[PDB]
Amino acid sequence: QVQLVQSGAEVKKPGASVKVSCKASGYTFTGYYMHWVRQAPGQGLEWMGWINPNSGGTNYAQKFQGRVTMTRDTSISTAYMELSRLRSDDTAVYYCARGKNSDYNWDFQHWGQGTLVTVSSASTKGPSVFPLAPSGTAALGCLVKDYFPEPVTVSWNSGALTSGVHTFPAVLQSSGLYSLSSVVTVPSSSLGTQTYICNVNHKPSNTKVDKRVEPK
Amino acid sequence: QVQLQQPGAELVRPGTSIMLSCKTSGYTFTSYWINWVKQRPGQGLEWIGNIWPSDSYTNYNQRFKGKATLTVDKSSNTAFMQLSSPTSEDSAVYYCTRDFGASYVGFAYWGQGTLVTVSAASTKGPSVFPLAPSGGTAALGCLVKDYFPEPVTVSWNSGALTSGVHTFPAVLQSSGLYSLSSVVTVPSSSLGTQTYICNVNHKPSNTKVDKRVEP
Amino acid sequence: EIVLTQSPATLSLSPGERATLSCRASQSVSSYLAWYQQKPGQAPRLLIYDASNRATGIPARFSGSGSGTDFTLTISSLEPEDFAVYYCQQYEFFGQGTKLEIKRTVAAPSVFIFPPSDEQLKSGTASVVCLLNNFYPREAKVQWKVDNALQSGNSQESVTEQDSKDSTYSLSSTLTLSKADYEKHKVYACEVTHQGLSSPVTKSFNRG
Amino acid sequence: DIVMTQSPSSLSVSAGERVTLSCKSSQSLLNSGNQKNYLAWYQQKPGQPPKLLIYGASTRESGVPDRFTGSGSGTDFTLTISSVQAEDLAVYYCQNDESYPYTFGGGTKLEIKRTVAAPSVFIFPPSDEQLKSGTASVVCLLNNFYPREAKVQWKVDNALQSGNSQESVTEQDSKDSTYSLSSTLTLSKADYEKHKVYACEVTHQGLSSPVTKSFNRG
Ligand SMILES: [N+]
Ligand SMILES: [N+]
Ligand SMILES: [N+]
Ligand SMILES: [N+]
Ligand SMILES: [N+]
Ligand SMILES: [N+]
Ligand code: NA
């Protein structure tokens, strides 16, 4: 079956350049065009351009004209997407896409997994963990504030507690750093006899925090 | 071919913004980033910012404390710069340059630069005086005394004479006015035959003078 | 440029029911229209091509029809895995997309408020969290009031995806202040309005 | 921010020698995704805007001679000039093109060493057109000399002048690599016509003894 394997997530600063690869297999690379599509967070799909792996000729959307450069290395069935002078607008997941066949050349039957490119000048920073003290059932949580890059994981009592949890998605603050909160409802009788600990992990900055949440 | 036309100079008063322009031609205005670069006379280069004319997206150097704003006029393919609350610190040449290209590196095309003078002194046109010669080879020139602001351009015989010419940098006199001299060495045998003319142009005062230098 | 408008923005239906999605183009297109499914974190998947032909490995319940400027996608009888986002595509243009949501009985939010922690206040910042827990529908208005002064700009809220059991939602709203300005006031309230609430609910605390 | 460093700031070299300019960078200018060193070298000749010489740390711009070559990677970069020419006179700049804010190095001025050349000295009395306005400018010209160091002294009726003349020097010529200097003695018409002799004494390494040009009038 057709496979479109893309490169890994990149984090670039404004004014830099990113290059995404898309290795194809399962068919003849030169027989079909290769399209590129991106998707800003919370947004729809946006077409960028296509390339002819036989000719190397390209055609980009007006929006990216003079901003993007598409190339291929047929020797390795790989297509490339280079976006220059990066803007905060360019934070998005970038897919490579290929049509069904010559008759239905714009019905993208095959998509790569996508490559998340994040454009930010923030330095790699770990989160500050603050408790949300509880006051039949009782709701408590943790505030994970001011961390960069985005992936943060939160557990409760090292996976022993999993029912009733609500780890909200992260929000991008004006400082360019992320923040979120993880809450969980528990029986009030548990507050007096059971202990609750947030298990935060921010792998990038190698920050792994354990915070106790006790009633006020 | 690609071309970036900037005005020769601009005189700005403290308390009024600088307002530079860059008329573009020779390529698709909305397909390349434009940058603005600062250079005080005799010093280095400083990157002010850039703009994507298609939608006017701007990035700025933080050293300018937000005093600079970049805009364009896509109908005229012109990129503008503006600098508020200017001081003598801001007197300099301001270049307008375009990116080489998406996949390229650096700045390929540059404008000649606009020499901005931030000052409350008024404009004054120059007074051109002759430096008469007095066989072998003889020396003669012109004295461009008392003008403000800089610069002035000088040519000889409407550009037909360029070999042996030396137009010296302008000096600031104790009067607060600039002054320079343009000189050329010529065969003394030609003094009687040929006529030599200085061409002095001071655009800030809309002054253009021609003076026939004679023995 | 062709503009593709999809409707509705959010389609709320129950499993087993029939769903009908629509996509309108600015200009006539004949029948060069495709549909796609996308779930969070996953790449799109082609459903229909040429407006009405099922793509590879697509269940029969999916189907589309239309021509010119009016197109529809229809799932004859929804199933759990069908709830997702759906896009239409024409040449180089995509639609805004429609989110297919699970419908269920109205559920009111459980509203809780959390004052700043002491450790955070030592560092000169104060964060106040207001939780809306296990409610439905999605829409909810959250307004902060400090000493009855309606606040603005200093809050940001975050909503969870639909719970895979009670199809409910959960929303957080964090109001960020400086320690200084947080001590200048006392009453910090969180006014909530939701269809499952006969009247608006306001939870608050003192000692600011 | 990325700060670009160029040291030394000035180099004196003869035509035909090999020159090496250095450029350091705080952070790496290499982009691992595409493996381009986002570095540019610029040549700025007197009275002109910077010209793009090398881009991509090693690629030469169209028309650049074969004697210019760039190298380096990451944080250390070098621009080499094999067999320097007189036209190569300029200030060369480094530029970080990797991420905002784009920054330049301090630049390295390239001076051209040359065999000694004595100046050709001239003097020009004030024109009558100027005198009628109430001021007199006496000009002294030193034409095509090397090195740049030169002492000029005005003497009026044998009396040395101090603090009323202003010099200006041209940047060395792109062909013969010589300098030109002008000294201007500005006086009041009244004071100018109080004296007879006006002389310009020039001392330069290319002169066994000082030369002097003078005139009698005023
Ligand atoms: N195609
Ligand atoms: N500055
Ligand atoms: N603008
Ligand atoms: N280009
Ligand atoms: N299509
Ligand atoms: N999907
Ligand atoms: Na207790």
mmCIF file of C-alpha atoms and ligand atoms in Angstrom, chain A residues 188 191-193 215, ligand 7:
data_model
loop_
_atom_site.group_PDB
_atom_site.id
_atom_site.type_symbol
_atom_site.label_atom_id
_atom_site.label_comp_id
_atom_site.label_asym_id
_atom_site.label_seq_id
_atom_site.Cartn_x
_atom_site.Cartn_y
_atom_site.Cartn_z
ATOM 1 C CA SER A 188 -15.208 14.475 50.237
ATOM 2 C CA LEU A 191 -10.022 14.350 51.332
ATOM 3 C CA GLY A 192 -9.770 13.444 55.014
ATOM 4 C CA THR A 193 -8.070 10.070 54.486
ATOM 5 C CA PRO A 215 -7.505 21.003 51.592
HETATM 6 NA NA NA E 7 -9.768 16.788 55.955
#
